[PDB]
Amino acid sequence: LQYGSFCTQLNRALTGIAVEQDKNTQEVFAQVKQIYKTPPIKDFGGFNF
Amino acid sequence: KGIYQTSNFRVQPTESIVRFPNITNLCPFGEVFNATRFASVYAWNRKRIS
Numbered sequence: 001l002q003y004g005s006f007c008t009q010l011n012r013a014l015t016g017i018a019v020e021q022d023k024n025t026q027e028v029f030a031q032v033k034q035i036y037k038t039p040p041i042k043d044f045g046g047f048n049f
Numbered sequence: 050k051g052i053y054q055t056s057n058f059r060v061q062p063t064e065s066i067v068r069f070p071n072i073t074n075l076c077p078f079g080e081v082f083n084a085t086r087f088a089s090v091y092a093w094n095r096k097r098i099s
């Protein structure tokens with residue numbers, strides 16, 4: 001406690017890093033809000049997916 | 050509006066378990082400091098005390 005607010009600063013930096021990682025994942029994966037479903041019948045011109 | 054990760058400042062009482070080996074008998078301190086014949090500085094005696 002004589003040293004000061006080092007631990008709070010490190011915890012804040014790590015929390016910001018984790019929030020930034022979650023933001024990166026959300027901004028790289030949640031591009032579209034409409035969850036489209038694949039059709040049950042697959043006849044895409046002979047292309048096999 | 051958010052979620053914060055913080056520390057703790059609480060205090061708790063103490064419960065202790067003490068494990069000490071099976072030992073009963075004294076070891077000689079009242080005769081090494083009370084001996085009449087003491088060794089010299091070149092030929093200092095060395096006694097293992099257990």
Ligand SMILES: *[C@@H]1O[C@H](CO)[C@@H](O)[C@H](O)[C@H]1NC(C)=O
Pocket residue numbers: 078079080082083
């Ligand atoms: C040496 O002997 C005296 C009495 O003879 C005793 O009071 C003293 O405690 C002894 N020394 C040690 C280190 O026990």
